[PDB]
Design a protein around this nucleic acid. Structure first.
Length: 79
RNA sequence: UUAUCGGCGAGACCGGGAUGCACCUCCCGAAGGGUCU
């Protein structure tokens, strides 16, 4: 329970991204990050802590975390 | 993060030759002097 505001996160890719069929969801990245932060791999507690930093759609059952989208500049494109 | 895992690596001389030198005066003028046992 914390005031959540829509934010866009953009990062500089340093190495190739390997997509496992489904585009990587930022909710998964944050789940792994919390699993590192909270020394526990139990999905329940990591999810409960993830809901505290991410807005969760109860009616839809997902986190408000868009999938990966490649930011391409006029210099470098998707390769 | 659609799973679980994986050093890319090992060997090599790049070196062998050459004068950069050949010609020029920098000189032309002046009083530093005068005051005190």
């Amino acid at each position: 329970m914390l005031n959540f505001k829509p934010y866009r996160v953009i990062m500089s890719s340093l190495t190739p991204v390997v997509i496992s069929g489904i585009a990587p969801s930022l909710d998964g990245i944050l789940y792994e990050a919390l699993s590192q932060a909270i020394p526990s791999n139990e999905p329940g507690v990591v999810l409960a802590r993830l809901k505290e930093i991410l807005l969760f759609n109860d009616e839809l059952g997902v986190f408000h975390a868009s999938s990966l989208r490649f930011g391409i500049t006029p210099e470098q494109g998707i390769g």
